[PDB]
RNA sequence: UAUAAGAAAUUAUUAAGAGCAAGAGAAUUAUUUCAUUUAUAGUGAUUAUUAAUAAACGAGGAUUAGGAGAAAUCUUAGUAAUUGUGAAUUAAAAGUAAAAAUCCGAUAAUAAUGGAAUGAUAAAAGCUAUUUAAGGUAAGAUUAAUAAAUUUAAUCCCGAGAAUAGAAACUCUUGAAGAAGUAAAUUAUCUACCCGUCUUGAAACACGGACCAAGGAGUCUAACAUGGAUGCGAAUGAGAAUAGCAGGAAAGCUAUAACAUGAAGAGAAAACGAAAAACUAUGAGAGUGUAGAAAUACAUUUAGCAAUAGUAUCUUUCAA
RNA sequence: UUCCACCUGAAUAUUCCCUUAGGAAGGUCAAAGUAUUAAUAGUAUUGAUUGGUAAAGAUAAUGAUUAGGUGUAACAUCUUGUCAAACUAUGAAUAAACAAAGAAGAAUUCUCAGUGUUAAAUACACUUCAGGAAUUUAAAUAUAAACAUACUUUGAAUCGGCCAAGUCUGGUAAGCAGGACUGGCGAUGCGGGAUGAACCGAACGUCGAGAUAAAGUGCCAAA
RNA sequence: AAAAUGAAGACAUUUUAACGAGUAAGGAAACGAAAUGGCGUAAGGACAACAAAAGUAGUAAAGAUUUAAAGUAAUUUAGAU
C-alpha cells in the first residue's frame, strides 16, 4: 500500500444544473460550451453559478440593481437568480439579465424603459461579457441562519427554536 | 526512443565505437610485443639451463646479460626510462613509510 | 537520521542518476504522473527553469 | 456527371487453391525478465634473467660395496669448518610500463547468443549507401618536444545535422471421424474448525439451531427542524369551513376571502417603535500593451457583488 | 430484525446526571452544501526563551548516617563512608510555546489630519503604520502541500475495551489492579514463528511474468 | 480527478493519471458528462405490429422439474418434459 493522507472522494462542486428542468439543462450546456471554447472567466463564473442549489442562488431586488448600477449607465446587470421587486422604491432605467423575473418586477423594469433579458440573449449579445455587472444576492439574510449553533453560548448565541413554553 | 530523448546519443555512440576499436587494436599490438618479449625471455632461460652441465668444476655462475632487447628506443628514451624507474621507487618508499607509521 | 530505520540512502553517481531518470523518470503534469517520453514534454513543464531536455534534467 | 478504383463471372499455364480456432516456427520489433559468454583507464600480488648483502633457521665436512631419479650430462639416498634456504634490500639486463591465467580489489554493465509472460506488423527522428562538414576533452591513429601529464603543436582518419536514393509482407500440424472452451462425476497435489449472537476475546466444555414449506419484525397519524427538486415572491396558501359549474362524477374546474405564516423589533409591563439615501479592508468580473510564441506569462486601466471582520448612525431595554 | 455491487469509515478522552448494564453536551465518522482562499504543517534548521525530570550533591541549605584526626563525654573544627517519592545549589535528552515579513508582498522620500498624552509640543499613542502623491520593488531558512486549504449544516454509531514494551505505581507475585507516550488487536485477511486476537514481514479489485520481505535450504517441505 | 467532445451514437462517451482491506455506521429518488450503480415481489396509470385489426396466448398461459446461455452479483434469458 501507499501512505496517503486521504483517499479519493467526490469533489463537492456541482458541475451541472440540478433537477430535471429542460431549459436550465440547456443553459448549462450553452455556457459549458462557451466556458470551454472562449476560455473566458466570465462564462466559467456563470456556468458555476448555474449549478448552485436554489438556496445558494438568492434573489436580488430591483433596489439592489438600482443602487449597484447608478455609476454604470450603459451597462447590463447579470444576476443568476430570480429578480424580485422592491415596491418601496422606484425603478430606474437599466438592462437586467436573470433566470427569472417577478411579474411585478418585469412590469416595473419595462415601464421605466429598461429591458428584462434572459441568459440566451446575453450570451448571444455579450458572450464573453463586455458591458456586464455581475451581482449575487445576500446569503446571510436567511432566517434559518439565526438558529445555527448553541443558544447558551456567550459570544454568538443561536435563536432558540420556538416550541413548548417559549417565553 | 533514446534518440528522440537524447539526440546527442548518436555522437556519443560513434565516439564509443572509435574507442572500442582503437583499444582492441592497441591491445592486439601490445599482445604481439609480449609474444616476442616472452620469447626472448624463454630463449635466455633455455640458454642458461646449460648451467646443469658439468676438477673442482664448481659454482656455475650464469651470464648477466642473457636477455636481449626487443623494442629499440632513442638515447633520450633510454635515459628517461632509468629516471622513471627512480621516480616509481620513490613513491613506493613514500607510500610504505606513511602506512608503516 | 530520524527516519533511519525506515529508509536506506547514500550518494548517487552520475550513472545512477542517468539510469534512474531514463528508466523510472516521470513528471507531475496537471496532477498526472506522466512518464518521460520526449523532450517536448520536458520543455512544457520545466522550460521556464531553463531546462528543455532530459540532459539538463540529469 | 469525369477519374483511377476496377467486384462477380470467363480464358491459357502451373510452385494450383477456403473461413474460423488451437499449436509450432520464420522476418522485424514494444514493455518486463531468465540463463550463458564477453571489456570494466586497481599503476595491487604472482607468472626463470643474472649477481650481491642478508634477520632468521635448522642441518650438513672432507668410497663405491648396496641403490633411487633421468637418457642428463647431473642430483640424491645411508653404512674442526666448510656449506644449504631465505623475509627485506640492492646492481646491471629487459621493459612506454594495456598480452593470457589465478588471487586481492572495483564494479555490475554495452553487446552477443538462446529462451519466457503480454502483445504488434506498419512505415520510420528506421537502418544502409552518396555528398559538404559541427564534432573525437587520457581513448580514433601516427609523429615530434618532454614526462611520475585527462600537456602541447602537425597531418591523416572516421564522421552528427542537412540534402540525395533504396531494399517486409511468411510456412507447417490439427479440427463435424468433433478443434478451442465450458459444465458434470471420479481420482490425485495443495487447500478448508459451526453458523447466528453477546463479547476484550468462540471452533469452543457459552447460548439458539433435528428437517422442510408457508407466515414473520422501523409502519401509520400528528407537531417541529434541516436538506435536495418545484410554483409564486413582499407576499405565499386559501382542496378553512363553505358556495357554485358541467356530467350522471368521493374525481376535475371556479369563487377579491376569514385566517395562518411573513413583511419590525425590543420590553415583565405601562409606554414605544429603526438612515449619516452609509464608511473601511480583502475580495468576483471586464478592457488594453508587450513577449514567449502553441497554449500562455508579465505590465497597465476600470469595477468593485457574495462572504468575513470592523465602524459611524438609528429602535426598544435597568442592561445590546 | 429479510436483496446485490461500489465508496468513505469509527469509538472507550472531557462535563453533568438517584450517575456505574443507561442518558445529554462534546470528541471521532458519513452524507449533503459552499468559499478564490489574512485560509497549510503530528517535520527539520537558525535565533531568543520556559521547565526542574534522569543525572549530580551530601561540613552547599532541610533531613538521615559510619568512622578518624586537632583544640577547648560534650562542643567546635578538618577529614571519611553511605543516602532521600513527599531534600536541593546545578541540571540534561526527549519536549512546550515564539519568530524567520498578510489591513492583505517590501521599502524609501515628500505632504499630512482628528482626538488625547504632554509644561507646551513639531515628541508620543491610536486612528485601513487616518489619509494623499511619487520612486523603488516580488527579497527575506529547508522540505512538502490545488482532487491544497477553510469550512457550514444535518445526522449515525460509540464512550464494558484488551495487548506489546530498552516505562511507572500497589502487591511476594500473578495470564493481578491501575496509569504516561506510541504502535496494534478489536474492525484484519495474507507470508513466517509446527499450533496461537495482539510477535515478525507486510495490509487485500480479478490475473500473468519477474525481482524480493520476515525467515529458511537432510526428509516431511520449495531451496 | 483533469482535459476533449457532446442531441442521442452507447457499453453511463474519449484520453491520461492516481487509487481499491474493513466491524458499528453513512451514502432516499431525480439531476449529459448525471451529488454511488443496480436485481427481485405485488397492485395502480400509461405505453407495446403506425398504412383502418396494433404485446403474447388451445399451433398451448401461469406454475413445477431439469439443461444451457448472459451477468462480478442480486438475477435474467431460452430449450425439453
Amino acid at each position: 500500500a501507499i501512505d496517503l493522507d486521504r483517499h479519493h472522494v467526490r469533489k463537492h462542486v456541482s458541475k451541472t444544473a440540478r433537477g430535471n428542468n429542460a431549459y436550465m439543462k440547456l443553459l448549462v450546456r450553452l455556457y459549458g460550451f462557451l466556458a470551454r471554447r472562449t476560455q473566458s472567466k466570465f462564462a466559467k463564473t456563470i456556468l458555476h453559478r448555474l449549478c448552485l442549489s436554489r438556496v445558494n442562488r438568492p434573489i436580488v431586488s430591483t433596489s439592489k440593481l438600482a443602487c449597484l448600477m447608478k455609476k454604470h449607465p450603459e451597462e447590463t446587470a447579470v444576476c443568476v437568480n430570480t429578480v424580485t421587486y422592491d415596491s418601496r422604491y422606484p425603478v430606474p432605467k437599466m438592462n437586467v439579465c436573470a433566470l427569472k423575473f417577478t411579474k411585478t418586477a418585469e412590469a416595473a423594469i419595462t415601464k421605466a424603459g429598461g429591458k428584462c433579458l434572459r441568459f440566451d440573449e446575453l450570451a448571444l449579445k455579450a458572450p464573453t461579457g463586455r458591458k456586464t455587472v455581475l451581482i449575487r444576492g445576500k446569503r446571510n439574510v436567511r432566517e434559518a441562519l439565526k438558529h445555527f449553533g448553541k443558544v447558551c453560548a456567550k459570544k454568538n448565541p443561536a435563536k432558540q427554536y420556538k416550541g413548548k413554553q417559549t417565553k | 526512443a533514446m534518440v528522440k530523448l537524447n539526440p546527442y546519443a548518436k555522437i556519443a555512440s560513434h565516439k564509443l565505437a572509435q574507442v572500442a576499436k582503437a583499444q582492441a587494436a592497441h591491445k592486439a599490438q601490445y599482445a604481439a610485443k609480449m609474444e616476442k618479449i616472452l620469447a626472448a625471455k624463454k630463449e635466455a632461460l633455455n640458454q642458461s639451463v646449460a648451467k646443469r652441465f658439468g676438477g673442482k668444476v664448481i659454482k656455475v655462475k650464469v651470464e648477466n646479460n642473457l636477455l636481449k632487447a626487443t623494442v629499440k628506443r632513442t638515447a633520450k628514451q633510454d635515459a628517461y626510462m632509468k629516471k622513471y624507474d627512480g621516480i616509481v621507487k620513490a613513491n613506493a618508499k613514500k607510500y610504505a613509510e606513511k602506512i608503516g607509521f | 537520521r530520524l527516519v533511519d530505520p525506515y529508509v536506506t540512502y547514500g550518494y548517487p553517481t552520475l550513472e545512477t542518476v542517468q539510469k534512474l531518470i531514463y528508466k523510472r523518470g516521470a513528471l507531475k503534469i496537471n496532477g498526472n504522473r506522466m512518464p518521460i517520453t520526449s523532450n517536448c514534454m520536458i520543455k512544457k513543464a520545466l522550460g521556464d527553469k531553463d531546462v528543455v531536455c532530459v540532459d539538463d534534467l540529469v
Side-chain angles (χ1 to χ4, degrees):
Chain A
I2 171 153
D3 186 23
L4 303 157
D5 283 87
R6 81 182 38 78
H7 276 90
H8 293 334
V9 202
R10 160 188 93 84
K11 188 179 304 202
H12 279 243
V13 184
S14 187
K15 293 162 288 170
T16 166
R18 286 147 185 275
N20 234 354
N21 193 343
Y23 300 93
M24 291 272 326
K25 276 290 175 193
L26 211 164
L27 264 181
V28 162
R29 268 285 214 109
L30 168 62
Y31 274 99
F33 173 87
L34 279 170
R36 177 162 27 94
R37 296 285 281 269
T38 52
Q39 283 280 8
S40 76
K41 298 197 270 142
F42 181 83
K44 310 249 192 74
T45 282
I46 304 290
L47 171 73
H48 174 90
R49 293 188 195 172
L50 281 166
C51 311
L52 302 191
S53 84
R54 171 168 144 155
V55 86
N56 297 324
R57 285 190 280 99
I59 59 187
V60 176
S61 81
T62 53
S63 283
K64 263 275 294 292
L65 305 167
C67 296
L68 289 172
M69 305 261 312
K70 218 169 292 292
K71 39 216 298 291
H72 294 118
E74 68 287 323
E75 235 81 346
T76 318
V78 179
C79 0
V80 201
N81 51 53
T82 308
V83 164
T84 55
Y85 173 53
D86 193 1
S87 45
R88 308 166 291 176
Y89 305 119
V91 192
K93 184 178 118 46
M94 86 204 141
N95 316 285
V96 198
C97 166
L99 285 189
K100 202 185 125 210
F101 282 93
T102 288
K103 302 186 279 271
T104 58
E106 181 150 17
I109 292 179
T110 289
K111 193 196 234 322
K115 274 192 61 46
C116 290
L117 305 158
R118 267 89 201 154
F119 272 100
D120 40 301
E121 304 137 16
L122 171 88
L124 183 75
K125 160 184 85 173
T128 48
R130 284 203 160 259
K131 314 300 290 316
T132 56
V133 180
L134 263 173
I135 300 167
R136 24 179 180 184
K138 309 196 67 54
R139 258 188 221 194
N140 56 17
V141 299
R142 195 153 56 101
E143 103 185 320
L145 298 202
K146 310 281 263 194
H147 312 277
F148 287 166
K150 287 154 141 232
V151 13
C152 80
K154 282 195 307 280
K155 281 315 284 189
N156 293 124
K159 212 39 86 162
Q160 203 235 40
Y161 286 125
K162 73 172 284 300
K164 182 201 172 183
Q165 219 93 34
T166 280
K167 68 177 82 143
Chain B
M2 179 51 63
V3 168
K4 181 200 199 90
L5 270 168
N6 192 26
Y8 189 75
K10 276 188 178 194
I11 299 156
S13 299
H14 163 255
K15 159 179 188 21
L16 275 191
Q18 285 186 160
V19 176
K21 210 203 308 200
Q23 290 302 125
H26 273 230
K27 219 196 109 174
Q29 156 198 0
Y30 192 146
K33 166 179 102 190
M34 304 274 328
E35 286 179 303
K36 40 93 162 154
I37 283 181
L38 296 144
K41 215 164 54 79
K42 268 206 36 58
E43 307 337 319
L45 160 78
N46 311 135
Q47 209 178 324
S48 72
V49 87
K51 88 165 99 197
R52 195 161 315 272
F53 285 81
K56 273 199 261 272
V57 167
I58 275 145
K59 86 72 191 163
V60 157
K61 246 54 145 143
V62 227
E63 194 172 354
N64 162 249
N65 61 303
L66 280 153
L67 213 29
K68 305 285 111 163
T70 89
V71 37
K72 194 45 75 190
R73 64 195 98 263
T74 88
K76 291 188 291 187
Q77 315 185 330
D78 226 349
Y80 163 68
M81 277 186 108
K82 297 215 150 279
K83 195 234 165 184
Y84 187 82
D85 298 4
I87 278 274
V88 155
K89 190 142 289 143
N91 295 329
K93 256 206 59 192
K94 188 211 263 143
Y95 175 85
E97 173 263 293
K98 153 171 104 184
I99 287 323
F101 283 3
Chain C
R1 142 155 77 261
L2 299 194
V3 303
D4 247 5
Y6 299 98
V7 308
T8 194
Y9 59 103
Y11 318 123
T13 64
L14 175 63
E15 303 70 307
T16 286
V17 179
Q18 272 173 329
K19 272 194 278 277
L20 264 172
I21 288 201
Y22 272 142
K23 191 150 139 34
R24 312 282 180 158
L27 296 165
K28 328 178 317 159
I29 287 168
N30 293 37
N32 286 21
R33 188 195 183 281
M34 320 279 327
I36 291 156
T37 46
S38 59
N39 298 331
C40 301
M41 68 157 306
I42 303 186
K43 183 200 195 166
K44 279 187 191 164
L46 303 150
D48 81 60
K49 300 288 165 183
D50 204 36
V51 181
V52 310
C53 76
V54 85
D55 190 287
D56 317 54
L57 207 61
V58 167

